[PDB]
Design a protein around this motif. Structure first.
Motif, mmCIF file in Angstrom:
data_model
loop_
_atom_site.group_PDB
_atom_site.id
_atom_site.type_symbol
_atom_site.label_atom_id
_atom_site.label_comp_id
_atom_site.label_asym_id
_atom_site.label_seq_id
_atom_site.Cartn_x
_atom_site.Cartn_y
_atom_site.Cartn_z
ATOM 1 N N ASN A 1 97.644 130.705 101.017
ATOM 2 C CA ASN A 1 96.737 131.743 100.529
ATOM 3 C C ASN A 1 97.177 132.240 99.163
ATOM 4 O O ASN A 1 98.234 132.862 99.034
ATOM 5 C CB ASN A 1 96.683 132.925 101.490
ATOM 6 C CG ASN A 1 95.941 132.620 102.757
ATOM 7 O OD1 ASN A 1 94.997 131.836 102.764
ATOM 8 N ND2 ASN A 1 96.355 133.252 103.845
ATOM 9 N N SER A 2 96.354 132.003 98.150
ATOM 10 C CA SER A 2 96.630 132.498 96.805
ATOM 11 C C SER A 2 96.260 133.973 96.754
ATOM 12 O O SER A 2 95.119 134.339 96.476
ATOM 13 C CB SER A 2 95.859 131.693 95.770
ATOM 14 O OG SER A 2 94.504 131.553 96.153
ATOM 15 N N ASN A 3 97.234 134.836 97.028
ATOM 16 C CA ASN A 3 97.003 136.270 97.001
ATOM 17 C C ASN A 3 98.165 137.003 96.354
ATOM 18 O O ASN A 3 98.577 138.072 96.814
ATOM 19 C CB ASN A 3 96.749 136.822 98.397
ATOM 20 C CG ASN A 3 97.725 136.304 99.424
ATOM 21 O OD1 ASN A 3 98.781 135.780 99.095
ATOM 22 N ND2 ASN A 3 97.376 136.466 100.689
ATOM 23 N N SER A 4 98.718 136.449 95.283
ATOM 24 C CA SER A 4 99.734 137.171 94.538
ATOM 25 C C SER A 4 99.061 138.057 93.498
ATOM 26 O O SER A 4 97.834 138.115 93.393
ATOM 27 C CB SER A 4 100.716 136.196 93.898
ATOM 28 O OG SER A 4 100.125 135.536 92.798
ATOM 29 N N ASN B 1 108.621 129.279 98.480
ATOM 30 C CA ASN B 1 107.901 130.005 99.516
ATOM 31 C C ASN B 1 108.071 129.311 100.857
ATOM 32 O O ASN B 1 108.118 128.081 100.932
ATOM 33 C CB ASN B 1 106.417 130.119 99.183
ATOM 34 C CG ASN B 1 105.811 131.397 99.681
ATOM 35 O OD1 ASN B 1 106.516 132.302 100.107
ATOM 36 N ND2 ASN B 1 104.493 131.479 99.636
ATOM 37 N N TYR B 2 108.162 130.113 101.920
ATOM 38 C CA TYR B 2 108.187 129.599 103.283
ATOM 39 C C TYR B 2 107.157 130.276 104.175
ATOM 40 O O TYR B 2 107.178 130.066 105.391
ATOM 41 C CB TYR B 2 109.575 129.752 103.910
ATOM 42 C CG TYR B 2 110.717 129.515 102.963
ATOM 43 C CD1 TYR B 2 111.537 130.555 102.568
ATOM 44 C CD2 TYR B 2 110.979 128.250 102.465
ATOM 45 C CE1 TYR B 2 112.586 130.344 101.701
ATOM 46 C CE2 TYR B 2 112.023 128.029 101.597
ATOM 47 C CZ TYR B 2 112.820 129.079 101.218
ATOM 48 O OH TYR B 2 113.863 128.860 100.355
ATOM 49 N N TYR B 3 106.262 131.078 103.613
ATOM 50 C CA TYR B 3 105.222 131.758 104.367
ATOM 51 C C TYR B 3 103.853 131.392 103.816
ATOM 52 O O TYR B 3 103.726 130.671 102.827
ATOM 53 C CB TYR B 3 105.416 133.275 104.328
ATOM 54 C CG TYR B 3 106.777 133.718 104.777
ATOM 55 C CD1 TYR B 3 107.718 134.151 103.863
ATOM 56 C CD2 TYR B 3 107.127 133.694 106.115
ATOM 57 C CE1 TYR B 3 108.968 134.551 104.264
ATOM 58 C CE2 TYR B 3 108.376 134.092 106.525
ATOM 59 C CZ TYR B 3 109.290 134.519 105.594
ATOM 60 O OH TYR B 3 110.539 134.918 105.994
ATOM 61 N N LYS B 4 102.820 131.906 104.471
ATOM 62 C CA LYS B 4 101.444 131.651 104.074
ATOM 63 C C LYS B 4 100.886 132.711 103.136
ATOM 64 O O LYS B 4 99.679 132.719 102.885
ATOM 65 C CB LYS B 4 100.555 131.541 105.310
ATOM 66 C CG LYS B 4 100.472 132.820 106.113
ATOM 67 C CD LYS B 4 99.376 132.752 107.149
ATOM 68 C CE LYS B 4 99.214 134.089 107.851
ATOM 69 N NZ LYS B 4 100.464 134.511 108.536
ATOM 70 N N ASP B 5 101.726 133.601 102.614
ATOM 71 C CA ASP B 5 101.293 134.680 101.738
ATOM 72 C C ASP B 5 102.041 134.573 100.418
ATOM 73 O O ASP B 5 103.272 134.663 100.391
ATOM 74 C CB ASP B 5 101.539 136.037 102.390
ATOM 75 C CG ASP B 5 100.626 136.289 103.567
ATOM 76 O OD1 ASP B 5 99.497 135.756 103.570
ATOM 77 O OD2 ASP B 5 101.036 137.020 104.492
ATOM 78 N N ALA B 6 101.297 134.364 99.332
ATOM 79 C CA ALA B 6 101.869 134.100 98.018
ATOM 80 C C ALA B 6 102.549 135.303 97.393
ATOM 81 O O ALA B 6 103.280 135.135 96.416
ATOM 82 C CB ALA B 6 100.793 133.586 97.070
ATOM 83 N N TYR B 7 102.340 136.499 97.923
ATOM 84 C CA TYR B 7 103.060 137.661 97.436
ATOM 85 C C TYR B 7 104.459 137.769 98.020
ATOM 86 O O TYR B 7 105.166 138.732 97.713
ATOM 87 C CB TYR B 7 102.259 138.933 97.712
ATOM 88 C CG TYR B 7 101.846 139.194 99.132
ATOM 89 C CD1 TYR B 7 102.646 139.946 99.969
ATOM 90 C CD2 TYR B 7 100.626 138.756 99.610
ATOM 91 C CE1 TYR B 7 102.268 140.220 101.242
ATOM 92 C CE2 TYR B 7 100.240 139.021 100.895
ATOM 93 C CZ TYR B 7 101.073 139.752 101.706
ATOM 94 O OH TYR B 7 100.705 140.028 102.994
ATOM 95 N N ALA B 8 104.867 136.811 98.847
ATOM 96 C CA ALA B 8 106.216 136.732 99.382
ATOM 97 C C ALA B 8 107.119 135.803 98.587
ATOM 98 O O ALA B 8 108.311 135.726 98.886
ATOM 99 C CB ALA B 8 106.171 136.270 100.836
ATOM 100 N N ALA B 9 106.596 135.123 97.578
ATOM 101 C CA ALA B 9 107.325 134.060 96.913
ATOM 102 C C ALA B 9 108.370 134.631 95.964
ATOM 103 O O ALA B 9 108.476 135.842 95.759
ATOM 104 C CB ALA B 9 106.358 133.145 96.175
#
Ligand SMILES: CCCCCCCCCCCCC/C=C\[C@H](O)[C@H](N)CO
Lengths: 242, 213, 214, 287, 245, 58
Positions: free
Chosen positions: F4-7, F20-28
């Motif tokens: 999911n591109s949500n950064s 990244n290791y999750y499905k949320d790009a704000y965790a990268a």
């Protein structure tokens, strides 16, 4: 499962490490961006903007602080007289503290590059003058004559329609970078002095005022860099912010 | 050529008071005015430079001011070593013109003149020339005019007065008026009369002498 | 300490020329202006000219151009003023001042210059004593006249320096090219003519110290 | 066709990995070319190079400009709050504590964020718990992000701790600190640290005047902390939160504050102690 | 070839003989809101010749001890002209401005002004002169209107940030030996694509004399400063009845 | 197998390669930062181009 071994550095919290944390909202999508003007990407874009230098940082000007942004010129009686003198290192306590270059250099430890200083004349149109702005590499103190101060990097400024001159401070240094100078053993990073002298005189006709003021601006050139981020000592929190 | 007027030339106040010496210019001199003090006999001493600043060594009783073309030197309060002639100087243009000079004197009570005429000695007109004198002694103030009177007739020129400045602790003035004359016109007339008229006094203080006494 | 020391007095004939020196000391001599101020007796104070002893240039006043000329010797640190075509209006006191920031901060001592053609005359002491006819009253002043002397001045004393509480030494005022002064002493009539007074002139130029009693 | 009247940037982006070189120069003696004389009234900074004023060398600079980037200026974790649960005292004696999210109460991270007007970033919060002694005892805690409009806790045994929709995290005291990633959560396109305006309409009096500068777009809710249990624990808990900026954009640079801070919501300065930007000296001709 | 200029927008021209160049703030011109950034669904209105014209405000008086003045935008024009009526009938607003500041003086005067555009100019208060009392600035101070307001402490811009670093904002000087005008073209700078005209003030003009005015005793002492402003690409949305405040 | 591109930066990403290791790009991660600069809209925001060696106005 998989055989693993743990190393030193386990369960430490370094405040600068670039990791991957776990999110808190699965499926979130931020608000779409719009074109806001004036975007900034390096802090070197802001260091190249000219800001006002406080050459007149006297102990008598601290109750009327607006006078610290100007230096007066006048009609002289002697010839070849010293006008002002200040050091040229941006991270030191003194005139460079009022600039956006000086306030952003103190967030870093070392620096390297060339600086430019722009002197603007805010006198009358009927005024005539010539000044000598010199820069001296490290060594002795401020000179006593201008026959000593002419031996450095100097610019002859003539007043006229173009009411600004730019003195460049060249990068003359032993080392590639240069930490911030203090009163102690860290003063082998000194950059030298900048002096202003009267080349001929300041001449006015009848009716024109016999004292004008000069405002000084300072910024950085294109080969200016910074290194080793630190915390400034210009902000100090005492008790609490309510 | 900036003419610089200093008025007036004489002023007198007593000790512990306040003096104010004015100096007016003709052109703008850009506060480049300097005050001097000259005691009688010696060299001038610079007191004020730039109409505000004191030199190193002069006391804080002196303080100068001025704005425009009129300027001011003030002495508060006046001591006895501060009685001298005071000059202003303009150093904005050449020639560096000085002022007129305001002499300071001491203010005290009035004293009437004591006129004492002395006749010529007999041995001195034997050379062909006589000399009549009209001494007056210990009076105050200065601006008078003493008249020489021969048988009701007006006779000047030929006269000369020699005043003095103030004495030390009693503040009084003296004057010597004499005149030379060839001794043949000594026998024109007989009287010896000097009227010394005064400002407030209506009638002068007169002594007389005669040869036929 | 910075001090300026001028030459002594002079006295010359009409038409001659003099050279007044002014020696500076305790100062960088070749890098400051040295001025000259004239004081005519006894009302004025006027500028003449300045000199920069480094390069040697001179700036004169307009009413002293052809009369005064200035030089300077840096090997001795000494200024010079040569006044030429000296006349009777050239009898004044000539000062030597230096310029710091436009003003004259240090002055000399003051040399004096008189221009006259008369030669040294002995003075004549003439008494002024009452009197064949008038003595009124109980206190009467007395003096003695001195005429005919050059140069100024003489020192007239009374009774070998014992009278000082009644003396009046008057300044000279020249006439016909030759000076004239007077003195005065007040006595009560209880001491006159009990005190026959003693005028005593002393002129060290002509070495004529003649006395006089009454 | 019948009506005739019914029918742009300046600059360009450039990639610069190193500082600029200095080319060799010699003496110029001419007329009509004055590179030193500028015009400061035009608003433009002086474009005079070093080679147009002195006699220069040929220097190949390999000085990198990466550490001056905004992403490396803000990726350092700074303290944002100190939440305290005392056992005896006045603040939070009953085992729970709430804290409104205002990240502008400590001066070092505030002066860095207030160089710009608008900022749009992702965050990373780290939770460091200890006693006020500095020691650690085994006790389970619970932090919970309460969004605006959600019910806030009023006790240790409230229904708001059910965590049916709200994000929460259960942590002991003896384990490593807790890191979470927070996205860009504003209803606008960027955060405003300076909002020149009132959030509502209405006739403005002096009574309802403590809303000048309060933008609702930065209101982000509440951190609710508790010790998990119906009983009370005999331990004092002080928690320090640290924020790290990620994925940052920034607009409109500002002057940097030279006065001490007073309040969290407004830039009120002290008026009788207006301190100077530069250290003073005695004379302008001495150093 | 650079000192003379003409600025013609609407039915208003401004001619100048001795001006400097024109500053385009942050290198961008005023635009209309494109479809990729617009969030409202109504059709915005565009009066292109009735509101896009020059408006002259009240002239000030420069003295030897003047501290400096400021204005707020678009607060200065919410009571003037047909721009003030569209600001009262509509809920949304988007415009960019031309800002022109004039000050004539002789060739025997001297002085220098600093005309700057600070976006989101939030003012502060002296906190009672001791820091203990939490003051807030009144509504006559935060929204002064067509008259503008004066600065109390110009060294800290009444906000705790220095005057020495005001030039990072888009600015021009008015040096009385060089020029008599100062012209800045400002784009729409906001976080949202449209915002209200009665509540939010986008930027703030700020005229501060860094070098004081000085002449000789006898010259003209009445040296005024005047501000003329022009909206560019102004559009409004959200029609309703007229609200004045 | 995508994410999911949500950064806070997709069309204007200041980075190039993150972890990244999750499905949320704000965790990268933050990654390496770009070194793009456009300083001339703060140093010379003037309408007509001012040549350096020539005077700006006369
Ligand atoms: C379970 C852990 C929950 C952690 C939740 C933390 C959410 C914080 C979001 C960061 C928001 C950025 C700060 C925004 C605005 C500033 O504080 C303003 N100056 C407040 O007026």
């Amino acid at each position: 499962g998989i055989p693993t071994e743990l190393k030193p550095g386990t369960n430490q919290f370094l405040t600068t490490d670039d990791g991957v944390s776990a999110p808190i909202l699965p499926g979130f999508h931020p608000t779409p961006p719009i074109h806001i003007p004036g975007e900034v990407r390096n802090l070197l874009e802001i260091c190249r903007v000219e800001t006002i230098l406080e050459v007149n940082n006297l102990k008598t000007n601290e109750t009327t602080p607006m006078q610290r942004l100007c230096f007066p010129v006048s009609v002289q009686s002697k010839t070849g007289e010293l006008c002002a003198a200040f050091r040229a290192d941006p991270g030191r306590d003194g005139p460079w503290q009022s600039t956006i270059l000086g306030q952003l250099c103190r967030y870093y430890t070392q620096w390297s590059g060339s600086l430019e200083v722009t002197f603007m004349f805010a006198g009358s149109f009927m005024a005539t003058g010539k000044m000598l702005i010199a820069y001296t590499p490290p060594g002795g103190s401020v000179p006593a004559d201008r026959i000593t101060a002419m031996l450095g990097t100097h610019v002859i400024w003539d007043f006229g329609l173009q009411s600004s001159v730019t003195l460049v401070v060249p990068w003359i240094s032993n080392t590639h970078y240069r930490a911030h100078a203090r009163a102690g053993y860290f003063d082998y990073y000194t950059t030298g002095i900048i002096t202003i002298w009267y080349q001929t005189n300041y001449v006015v006709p009848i009716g024109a005022p016999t004292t004008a003021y000069i405002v000084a601006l300072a910024a950085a050139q294109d080969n200016f860099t910074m290194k080793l981020c630190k915390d400034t000592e210009d902000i100090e929190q005492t008790a609490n912010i309510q | 050529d900036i003419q610089m007027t200093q008025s007036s030339s004489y002023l007198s106040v007593s000790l512990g008071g306040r003096v104010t010496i004015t100096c007016k210019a003709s052109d703008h001199i850009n506060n480049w005015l300097a005050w001097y003090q000259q005691k009688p006999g010696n060299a001038p001493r610079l007191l004020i430079s730039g109409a505000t600043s004191l030199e190193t060594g002069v006391p804080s009783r002196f303080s100068g001011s001025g704005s425009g073309k009129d300027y001011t030197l003030s002495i508060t309060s006046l001591q006895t070593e501060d009685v001298a002639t005071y000059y202003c100087q303009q150093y904005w243009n050449s020639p560096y013109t000085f002022g007129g000079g305001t002499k300071l004197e001491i203010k005290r009570a009035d004293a009437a003149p004591t006129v004492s005429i002395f006749p010529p000695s007999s041995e001195q007109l034997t050379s062909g020339g006589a000399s009549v004198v009209c001494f007056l002694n210990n009076f105050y103030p200065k601006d008078i005019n003493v008249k020489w009177k021969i048988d009701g007739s007006e006779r000047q020129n030929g006269v000369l007065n020699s005043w003095t400045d103030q004495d030390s602790k009693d503040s009084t003035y003296s004057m010597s008026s004499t005149l030379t004359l060839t001794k043949d016109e000594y026998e024109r007339h007989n009287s010896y009369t000097c009227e010394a008229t005064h400002k407030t006094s209506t009638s002068p203080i007169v002594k007389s002498f005669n040869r036929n006494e | 300490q910075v001090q300026l020391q001028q030459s002594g007095p002079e006295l010359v004939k009409p038409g001659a020329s003099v050279k007044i020196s002014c020696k500076a000391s305790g100062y960088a001599f070749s890098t400051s202006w040295m001025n000259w101020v004239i004081q005519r007796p006894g009302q004025g104070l006027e500028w003449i000219g300045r000199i920069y002893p480094g390069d040697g240039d001179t700036n004169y006043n307009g009413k002293f151009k052809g009369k005064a000329t200035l030089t300077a010797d840096k090997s001795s640190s000494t200024a010079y003023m040569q006044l030429s075509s000296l006349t009777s209006v050239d009898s004044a006191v000539y000062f030597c001042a230096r310029r710091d920031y436009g003003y004259f901060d240090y002055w000399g001592q003051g040399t004096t210059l008189t221009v006259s053609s008369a030669k040294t005359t002995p003075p004549s002491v003439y008494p002024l004593a009452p009197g064949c006819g008038d003595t009124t009253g109980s206190s009467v002043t007395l003096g003695c006249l001195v005429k005919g002397y050059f140069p100024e001045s003489v020192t007239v004393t009374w009774n070998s320096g014992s009278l000082s509480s009644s003396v009046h030494t008057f300044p000279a005022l020249l006439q016909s090219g030759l000076y004239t002064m007077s003195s005065s002493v007040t006595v009560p009539s209880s001491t006159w003519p009990s005190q026959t007074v003693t005028c005593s002139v002393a002129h060290p130029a002509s070495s004529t110290t003649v006395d006089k009693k009454l | 066709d019948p009506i005739a009247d019914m029918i742009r940037s300046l600059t360009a982006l450039q990639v610069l990995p190193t500082a600029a070189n200095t080319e060799a120069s010699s003496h110029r003696l001419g007329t009509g070319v004055v590179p030193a004389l500028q015009a400061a009234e035009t608003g433009a900074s002086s474009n005079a190079s070093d080679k147009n004023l002195i006699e220069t060398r040929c220097v190949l600079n390999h000085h990198s400009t990466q550490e001056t980037a905004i992403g490396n200026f803000f990726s350092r974790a700074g303290l944002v709050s100190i939440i305290t649960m005392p056992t005896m005292g006045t603040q939070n004696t009953d085992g729970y504590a709430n804290w409104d999210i205002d990240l502008m109460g400590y001066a070092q991270l505030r002066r860095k964020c207030e160089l710009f007007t608008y900022m749009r970033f992702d965050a990373e919060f780290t939770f460091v718990v200890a006693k006020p002694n500095g020691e650690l005892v085994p006790q389970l805690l619970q932090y919970m992000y309460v969004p605006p409009g959600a019910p806030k806790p009023t006790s240790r045994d409230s229904f708001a701790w059910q965590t049916a929709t709200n994000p929460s995290v259960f942590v002991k005291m003896t384990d490593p600190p807790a890191q979470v990633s927070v996205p860009f959560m504003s209803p606008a396109s960027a955060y405003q640290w300076f909002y020149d305006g009132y959030p509502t309409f209405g006739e403005h009096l002096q009574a309802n005047d403590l809303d000048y500068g309060q933008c609702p777009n930065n209101m982000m809710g509440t951190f609710s902390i508790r010790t998990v249990g119906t009983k009370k624990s005999p331990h004092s808990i002080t928690l320090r939160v640290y924020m790290r900026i990620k994925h940052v954009r920034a607009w409109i640079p500002r002057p940097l504050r030279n006065q001490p801070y007073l309040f969290k919501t407004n830039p009120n300065y002290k008026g009788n102690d207006i301190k100077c930007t530069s250290t003073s000296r005695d004379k302008i001709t001495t150093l | 070839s650079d000192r003379v200029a003409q600025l013609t927008i609407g039915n208003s021209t401004i001619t100048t003989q001795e001006a400097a160049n024109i500053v385009i703030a942050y290198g961008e011109w005023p635009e209309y809101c494109p479809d990729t950034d617009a969030t409202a669904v109504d059709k915005p209105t565009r009066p292109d010749v009735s509101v896009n014209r020059f408006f002259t405000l009240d002239t000030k008086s420069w003295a030897k001890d003047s501290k400096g003045w400021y204005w707020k935008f678009p607060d200065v024009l919410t009571e003037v002209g047909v721009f003030g009526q569209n600001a009262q009938f509509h809920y949304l607003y988007r415009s960019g401005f031309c800002v022109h500041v004039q000050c004539n003086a002789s060739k025997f005067h001297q002085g220098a002004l600093l005309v700057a555009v600070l976006p989101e100019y939030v003012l502060g208060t002296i906190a009672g002169g001791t820091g203990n009392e939490n003051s807030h600035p009144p509504y006559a101070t935060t929204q002064p209107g067509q008259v503008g307001a004066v600065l109390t402490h110009p060294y800290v811009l009444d906000a705790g940030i220095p005057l020495s670093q005001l030039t990072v904002c888009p600015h021009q000087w008015i040096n009385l030996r060089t020029n008599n005008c100062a012209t800045i073209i400002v784009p729409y700078m906001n976080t949202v694509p449209f915002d209200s005209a009665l509540n939010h003030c986008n930027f703030g003009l700020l005229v501060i004399p860094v070098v004081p005015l000085d002449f000789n005793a006898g010259a003209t002492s009445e040296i005024p400063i005047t501000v003329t402003i022009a909206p560019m690409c102004a559009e409004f949305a959200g029609l309703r009845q007229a609200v004045k405040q | 197998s995508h994410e999911n591109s949500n950064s806070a930066s997709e069309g204007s990403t200041i980075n190039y390669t993150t972890i990244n290791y999750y499905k949320d790009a704000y965790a990268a991660s933050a990654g390496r930062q770009d070194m793009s600069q456009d300083p001339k809209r703060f140093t010379d925001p003037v309408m007509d181009v001012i040549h350096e060696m020539a005077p700006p106005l006369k």
